[PDB]
Amino acid sequence: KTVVVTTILESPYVMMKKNHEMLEGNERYEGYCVDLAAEIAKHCGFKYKLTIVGDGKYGARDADTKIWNGMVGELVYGKADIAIAPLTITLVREEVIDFSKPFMSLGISIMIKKGTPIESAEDLSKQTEIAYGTLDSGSTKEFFRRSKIAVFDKMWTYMRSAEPSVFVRTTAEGVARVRKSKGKYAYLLESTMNEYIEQRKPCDTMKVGGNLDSKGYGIATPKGSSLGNAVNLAVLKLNEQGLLDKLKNKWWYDKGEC
Ligand SMILES: Cc1onc(O)c1C[C@H](N)C(=O)O
Ligand SMILES: [Zn+2]
């Protein structure tokens, strides 16, 4: 009956409202994905319940365990009916779950502390004083692990062996590390997140260089779900009406602190 939506606490997609302890259910959250979930549900005609993914991950398959974690896992093992989050459409994920056409276009980018002498991925690969890493259990880490292009392969070789670990559990952890490391740590994350953080106080970070790739976020459902068709049509309809652009402007720039 009520559609269980799995999502992740990642600003500005899903965040706890200031007054959340005094609110119930869906009303406890706010953000781009909260606004989008309400719209997808209206257009598809279903009631839903937002739930935060238990392990706080996007989703990756464990080598040997072979078990999918994160939001992807919630869909794969039937714990959730749909995932509405900044979840990247990738080949390994699409082999186990279905994705709508993209609701947001983005690419991996570099985040630096203002003043850091780095202008590109090539710059990072060619040096060692400035450490750099990515988020764990996601599409960004897999991009570097599977890349056959020289610069990225060199970056992966360094990242996989760096000590202490250059990988972080959450985006907020990556941003804090950039902010606290005096220019000695750069963070590789999706352009969407980079652009968002660039507009938040203390306004000390910035996106440098172009995107390393081009991809998109999709609304995900278990393979063969009855919801897939309507959800994809809803995403296409909402993008064409300008809603997705209005939502990005609202959560990224209208509320910008810089
Ligand atoms: C958001 C975000 O920003 N940088 C990232 O790697 C991610 C996670 C990425 N969207 C995923 O699906 O794994
Ligand atoms: Zn609508």
From Swiss-Prot:
Coiled coil spans: none
According to UniProt, where does the site described as Interaction with the cone snail toxin Con-ikot-ikot lie?
61, 145, 237
**Entry binding sites for L-glutamate:** 86, 88, 93, 139-140, 190
Entry comment describing in which tissues the protein is expressed: Detected in forebrain. Detected in dendrites of neuronal cells. Expressed in the pyramidal cell layers of CA1 and CA3 and in the granule cell layer of the dentate gyrus.
Which positions bear Phosphoserine? 147, 181
Ranges facing Extracellular side: 117-258
List localization entries: Cell membrane; Postsynaptic cell membrane; Postsynaptic density membrane
Positions bearing the site annotation: Crucial to convey clamshell closure to channel opening: 118
> How is this protein induced?
Down-regulated in the pyramidal cell layer of CA1 in the hippocampus by global ischemia.
Modification after translation is described as: Palmitoylated. Depalmitoylated upon L-glutamate stimulation. Ubiquitinated by RNF167, leading to its degradation.
- The superkingdom of the source organism is Eukaryota
Disulfide-linked positions: 203-258
Question: Which family does this protein fall into?
Answer: Belongs to the glutamate-gated ion channel (TC 1.A.10.1) family. GRIA2 subfamily.
**What does this protein do, in the record's words?**
Ionotropic glutamate receptor that functions as a ligand-gated cation channel, gated by L-glutamate and glutamatergic agonists such as alpha-amino-3-hydroxy-5-methyl-4-isoxazolepropionic acid (AMPA), quisqualic acid, and kainic acid. L-glutamate acts as an excitatory neurotransmitter at many synapses in the central nervous system and plays an important role in fast excitatory synaptic transmission.
| Miscellaneous comment | The postsynaptic actions of L-glutamate are mediated by a variety of receptors that are named according to their selective agonists. This receptor binds AMPA (quisqualate) > L-glutamate > kainate.
Annotated domain remarks: The M4 transmembrane segment mediates tetramerization and is required for cell surface expression.
This protein's assembly is summarised as: Homotetramer or heterotetramer of pore-forming glutamate receptor subunits. Tetramers may be formed by the dimerization of dimers. May interact with MPP4. Forms a ternary complex with GRIP1 and CSPG4. Interacts with ATAD1 in an ATP-dependent manner. ATAD1-catalyzed ATP hydrolysis disrupts binding to ATAD1 and to GRIP1 and leads to AMPAR complex disassembly. Interacts with GRIP2. Interacts with GRIP1. Interacts with NSF via its C-terminus. Interacts with CACNG2, PICK1 and GRIP2. Interacts with GRIA1 and SYNDIG1. Part of a complex containing GRIA2, NSF and NAPA and/or NAPB.
Protein name, please? Glutamate receptor 2
Q: Which organism is it from?
A: Rattus norvegicus (Rat)
Gene, per the UniProt record? Gria2
